[PDB]
């Protein structure tokens, strides 16, 4: 199906973008899980700690 | 004696590319379709978690 000289690679590039970008939210959105792993951490540490104190 | 109608016809040879719509179309989803199953596998890892 006849196409100018430039066409099929400005639909190319349009698709390469797309993947950078849609590869930095997956980036970002495991970075963000990792903040709920640290968040419970602290959280259970504080009262493993407690505990220790009130029991001496 | 021109040939009008052959002149252009080769105006059009020199300055047209070839494309099938459905081979640009296969690609495109087959590279969009593999950051789309690492989104969902991530997703899917935290509330197993």
Known sequence: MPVLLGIPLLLRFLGFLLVTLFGYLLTFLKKGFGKIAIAISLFLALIIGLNSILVG | ?49
Not at chain 2, 8 to 36: F, I
């Open chain 2, 1 to 49: 004696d021109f040939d009008y109608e052959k002149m252009a016809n080769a105006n059009k040879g020199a300055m047209t590319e070839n494309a099938d719509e459905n081979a640009l179309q296969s690609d495109a989803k087959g590279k969009l379709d593999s950051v789309a199953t690492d989104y969902g596998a991530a997703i899917d890892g935290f509330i197993g978690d």
